[PDB]
Write a protein that binds this DNA or RNA. Sequence first.
DNA 1: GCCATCGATGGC
DNA 2: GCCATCGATGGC
Length: 53
Amino acid sequence: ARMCGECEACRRTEDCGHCDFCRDMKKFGGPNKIRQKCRLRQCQLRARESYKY
DNA sequence: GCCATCGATGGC
DNA sequence: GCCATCGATGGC
Ligand SMILES: [Zn+2]
Ligand SMILES: [Zn+2]
């Protein structure tokens, strides 16, 4: 739905740990208030423009 | 029950 | 219409 399953972003399995969305994750100490995927993982086709890197 | 991440929403 | 959230839910 928000994933083509085919782009670089979709195939990627590892969070960058450095974008705002990563910083937000509990995985990375963040408060978990934004709740979105790594920016490098936002599908290049289907994502909200303003989620992309 | 938790996690990953989506759609929704209120403020701007 | 957009952002910064926040409620919701599929998949585990
Ligand atoms: Zn990231
Ligand atoms: Zn994709």
